[PDB]
Each structure stands twice: as C-alpha cells, then as structure tokens.
Design a protein around this ligand. Structure first.
Ligand SMILES: *SCC1=CC(C)(C)N(O)C1(C)C
Ligand SMILES: *SCC1=CC(C)(C)N(O)C1(C)C
Lengths: 65, 66
C-alpha cells in the first residue's frame, strides 16, 4: 500500500544503484529491494533517499487510503 | 536524527491526540511517543500523518543531514 517511484527517478537522474547506495551507506541489494517493492525503508532511510535524489519524499514514496 | 514538528502542527490545527489517533488508526500512546521523541514512526505512518495533516512530509519530519 506504499507505491514507490525510486527506480524511475533514480534512472531519470542517471544515478546508479551502487552510487546511491554508497551515499546512503547501505547495500546495493537494499536499494534494489526497495525499488522492486520487496520491503520499505525506515523513515530515516526514506528521508535520506529523498535528500540524495533531491526530490520531495512523497514524489518517491506514496501512500493513499 | 530526525527532528519532528508533529506536536506544533497538530495543536495549531486544533486536533487532539486522541482525534489524530482515531483518524490514523493508531493509539494515542503512539502519537504521544512521537511527540515526546521516544518513538519512531514507520514510513507508512509518517506518510499517513502527512496525508491527513495536508503538509509536505518534510515539514513534519526533518532529517538532519549527516
Ligand atoms: S525531484 C521531482 C522529479 C524529478 C523528475 C525525475 C523529473 N520527476 O519525474 C519528478 C517530478 C518526480
Ligand atoms: S501545511 C504547512 C504548515 C501548516 C501550519 C501548521 C500552519 N504550519 O505552521 C506549517 C508551515 C508547518
């Protein structure tokens, strides 16, 4: 019930997974897992992802009732 | 570290803790713990809070860059 646009946005910005993972200090596998909807990040990791992609968080992770 | 403004925004909007809790389907203790900086709201809960408070999530929850 959270939609995410992480892969689309990352790719539009021409950032690789390995590049984003290093900024975030997480495994590339964890970025990939999020992109593929296998699990969601904690709030802090989500905020760091938004910070390093320079997009509002709700552009990347969307919830709606 | 995340700094949050939930108390301030909630009270400016005249929403009580139990009111917010009901709307979000969580306990009042959960809302209070976020506001007393005990408790870490999940990404989903944070998104629900931003949705109903109708503020950008980063107005409510701010990561301190590090
Ligand atoms: S930062 C917002 C943003 C950038 C871009 C990748 C061009 N987008 O499609 C959105 C609007 C998400
Ligand atoms: S929605 C943004 C917002 C509303 C109000 C509660 C009046 N605020 O102080 C901010 C700017 C957080």
């Amino acid at each position: 019930m959270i939609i995410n646009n992480l892969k689309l946005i990352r790719e539009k910005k021409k950032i690789s997974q390995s590049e984003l993972a290093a900024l975030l200090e997480v495994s590339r596998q964890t970025i990939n897992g999020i992109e593929k909807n296998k699990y969601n990040p904690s709030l802090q990791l989500a905020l760091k992802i938004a910070y390093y992609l320079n997009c509002p968080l709700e552009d990347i992770f969307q919830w709606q009732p």
